[PDB]
């Protein structure tokens, strides 16, 4: 569940969704990562159970099953840092990074 983005270090758990408008990214019970209305899927149906989506410190999307064994990787990587996967309103899942700038309301300015 949550929002329209996944940050590196966060997990999209089984049957969790990310939504922007009519586009809905679902980590399904059958281990397929599917972008509803977006004509995209990882294509990993029945490759595991209790599957989870993560995003690495190099900006790679990774699907892992219940055991923690890697089912699928996006196979595109960049330098070490913070990354964000976003359901773009044009109906694309896009990974952006690394972070270039941060506005921080939690520390003295």
């Amino acid at each position: 569940l949550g929002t329209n983005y996944l940050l590196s270090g966060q997990t999209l758990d089984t049957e969790g969704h990310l939504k922007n408008g009519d586009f809905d990214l679902v980590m399904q019970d059958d281990c397929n990562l599917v972008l509803y209305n977006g004509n995209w899927q990882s294509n990993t149906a029945n490759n595991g159970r209790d599957c989870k989506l993560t995003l690495t410190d190099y900006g790679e999307l990774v699907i892992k099953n219940g055991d923690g064994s890697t089912v699928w990787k996006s196979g595109a990587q960049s330098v070490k840092g913070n990354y964000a996967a976003v359901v773009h309103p044009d109906g694309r899942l896009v990974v952006f990074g690394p972070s270039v700038f941060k506005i921080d309301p939690w520390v003295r300015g």
Partner: protein, 110 residues
């Protein structure tokens, strides 16, 4: 023109005249007074540019630099974060941070 999403600003998109990004407990507002203000969190944040110009607008470019300009394109404030050419996004995150990420390194399609 790119469609707007409440918590996102992509390269080329513009906010002005009290247009804002919105998150769970936070707002980032390009105000009528030319101050860019993140409301919420312990301290909040501000470009600290109140009254510095007229009809100011916020634009993220395709190198990841976030800039406030006034009506005559006089630079008011810059994130000074220029990087490699490409697609960038500013996310007002549910945890309060406003973070610029890019360029894009993977996409599901064009």
């Amino acid at each position: 023109n790119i469609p707007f999403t409440n918590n996102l600003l992509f390269s080329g998109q513009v906010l002005y005249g009290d247009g804002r990004l919105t998150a769970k407990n936070h707002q980032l507002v390009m105000q009528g007074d030319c101050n860019l203000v993140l409301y919420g969190g312990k301290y909040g944040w501000q470009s600290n540019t109140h009254g510095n110009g007229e009809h100011c607008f916020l634009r993220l470019n395709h190198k990841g630099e976030l800039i406030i300009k006034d009506d005559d394109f006089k630079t008011i404030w810059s994130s000074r974060s220029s990087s490699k050419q490409g697609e960038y996004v500013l996310i007002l995150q549910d945890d309060g941070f406003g973070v610029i990420y890019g360029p894009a390194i993977f996409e599901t399609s064009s």
